[PDB]
Amino acid sequence: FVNQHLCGSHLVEALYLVCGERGFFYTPKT
Amino acid sequence: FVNQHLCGSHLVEALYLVCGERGFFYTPKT
Amino acid sequence: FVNQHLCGSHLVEALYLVCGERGFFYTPKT
Amino acid sequence: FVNQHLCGSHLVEALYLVCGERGFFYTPKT
Amino acid sequence: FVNQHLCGSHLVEALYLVCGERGFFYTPKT
Amino acid sequence: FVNQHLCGSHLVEALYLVCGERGFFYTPKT
């Protein structure tokens, strides 16, 4: 695949895509 | 604020907006 | 909730979310 | 341009694109 | 990665993400 | 209509909108 910058709501769109049913955590404080 | 009908990636969108820098966990059923 | 930068189509997504059925105006000329 | 089937936030998206800097009003029925 | 149920603009989103800088072609049936 | 900056996934959203059924190519290497 590829490597790009993924920021903000675009980051969480991508996580939704990749994780889907597995679910995910978005934790910007790290 | 008003009630929401949110499905697929649109939920993850709303969660991003609502939580901001605290982030969130997206956990669907099975 | 939180405070973030909301620009362009992300601004109008947020307005849709918050206003919903009430409807809204997006007027960048102010 | 082609005809559009637009629902929920996707309408507000299209309106953003079409109107640009003039902005727009989003006014749903009840 | 997980299986995807993608419709309308959400397909074009996924394709953008998957292909990145190589880009892609979006070709629906009739 | 209008003239704005269209970048990344926002570019391909716009192409989807304009082209629709015709389909399109997104080729950032040009």
Next chain:
Amino acid sequence: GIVEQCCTSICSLYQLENYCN
């Protein structure tokens, strides 16, 4: 209206343009 029309059947960009300020 336009909101319901674009969702229930179809809609054109030209009709959408009526909603710009």
Next chain:
Amino acid sequence: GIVEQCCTSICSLYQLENYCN
């Protein structure tokens, strides 16, 4: 849960706020 609830019927921003970290 919230995922299914927001999709199947409706959901509020306040209920969504329960899912922030």
Next chain:
Amino acid sequence: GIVEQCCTSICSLYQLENYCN
């Protein structure tokens, strides 16, 4: 306006309600 309040500067969801009809 909204762009200055929300994009250039920073705004809350409650502020965004200022622009509902």
Next chain:
Amino acid sequence: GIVEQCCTSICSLYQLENYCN
């Protein structure tokens, strides 16, 4: 095709990758 397949049933990222240039 892929457009209809991803919408009507399901689709994988690997199948989508076939559509990159």
Next chain:
Amino acid sequence: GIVEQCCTSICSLYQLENYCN
């Protein structure tokens, strides 16, 4: 190309049609 015409520079919806099939 499209990125230069539309992202780096500025483009219209009519220009975007240049990239339809």
Next chain:
Amino acid sequence: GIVEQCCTSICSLYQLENYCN
């Protein structure tokens, strides 16, 4: 974290899986 790995820097889809549950 994810923001540094993926937004400030550059990341792959395989890296993004690091943050699935």
